Amino acid sequence: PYTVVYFPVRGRCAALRMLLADQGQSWKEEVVTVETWQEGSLKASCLYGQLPKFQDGDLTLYQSNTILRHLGRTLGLYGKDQQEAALVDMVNDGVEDLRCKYISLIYTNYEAGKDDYVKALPGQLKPFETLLSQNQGGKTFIVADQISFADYNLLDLLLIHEVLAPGCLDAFPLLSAYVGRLSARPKLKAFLASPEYVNLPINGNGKQ
Amino acid sequence: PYTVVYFPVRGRCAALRMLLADQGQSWKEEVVTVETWQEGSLKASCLYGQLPKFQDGDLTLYQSNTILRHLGRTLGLYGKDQQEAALVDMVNDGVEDLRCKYISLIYTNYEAGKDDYVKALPGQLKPFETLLSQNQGGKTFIVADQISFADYNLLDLLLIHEVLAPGCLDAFPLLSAYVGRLSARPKLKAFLASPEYVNLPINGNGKQ
Ligand SMILES: N[C@@H](CCC(=O)N[C@@H](CS)C(=O)NCC(=O)O)C(=O)O
Ligand SMILES: N[C@@H](CCC(=O)N[C@@H](CS)C(=O)NCC(=O)O)C(=O)O
16 A cells, blocks of 8 residues: 655655554555666656655655655544644654754765764754653653654654764663663564664665 | 744745735734844743744744644645645645755855756746646646645745746746735735835845
8 A cells, every 4th residue: 555665775764664664554665776766767757856755545745754744644643633733743843854964964074074963962852852851751752642753753863863973862861761662662673673674774875 | 812933034934924914813923133042041942942933822833834734734724635635745845845945045155056056946946836737727726726834835935036036937837827826815915015024034144
């Protein structure tokens, strides 16, 4: 029923894959090689000339966050009412903002910019620790008491930053425990340990 | 019932203001001067240390797109069903991507980067013309047959780009007619002509 069209990297598809695996959904991975991409035709047929491309039956979507929100609506991972839905969006938009900065560092100036990025990290992660502290003492999810699509995206964001800066979560007990807890969910834990996750690089230029 | 807390610029609050005005809603503008911002306390109290900040009763939201989606959900400007809601999100995410590039040009290297930006513009605007052509001949809205929050955001994006590059819509008949049509809606037209819109600069560094 679902198809993910993407480069052979975790990148912007890692969160939605975790979501699908954790929700026990099945999907197909349509892999696009850089060589195939450079050919040009697939790219020209993409709405914004980029991937991921996602298919849910005959519904074709582009934009990683559009895919996350769509799955969030159809699978019931978007809060229980309008107010929670807004808080879920606020978290996801925050995650996207830091993901954009991470992507800029990785692909644009890893070598010269990493020191400053890492130095500024605590201030960028703190908002999520604060969100958790204001929600049942941080013992459940990022918004309210049920998992949402924002949790999967925030989880990915935290996992890749621990690779970029080992121990960056040591100063945030709530986020630390949160990562441990979500990573232990049976289906997610199995997915995270599997070759289809582990054998894909985080990014496409070999930096992490 | 609504309060918008922002710098005295259109920027990231222009689309949501257009939406509120067009929908006949009333709101309070709480203006924050750069001097007040530099003081530090308001900023430290902002979730992600940034504005806009929005209040809907006792619900406090941050993130311009979260505010747009919230208003979209509560005012019924998010498509008629889940499938349309996903298409609305796809359009908005695309608008955000080009808005990010516009903001980077404006604040980061207007002088040296404008020629290349303007040269790449047609290819960045074409996806929206294509979306319109695939939706009832581009005669109604960007998604389906009812206005959505994505329309207000795409409209702002188009208006600021015509200021940055006059005639950039000449090659796009559907987008051209779309801008004329939406700008003619009574309440929106009055808002667009009013001093509270007209006398605010588009950005905060005087470039446009
Ligand atoms: N806003 C888009 C960004 C998509 C994006 O940056 N795609 C990259 C790979 S992660 C791409 O397709 N690069 C190839 C190109 O632009 O030609 C999303 O979140 O899906
Ligand atoms: N992702 C945020 C971006 C917010 C943003 O860039 N805010 C700027 C002005 S538009 C700001 O608050 N600048 C002051 C600062 O960062 O100290 C949104 O879309 O609301």
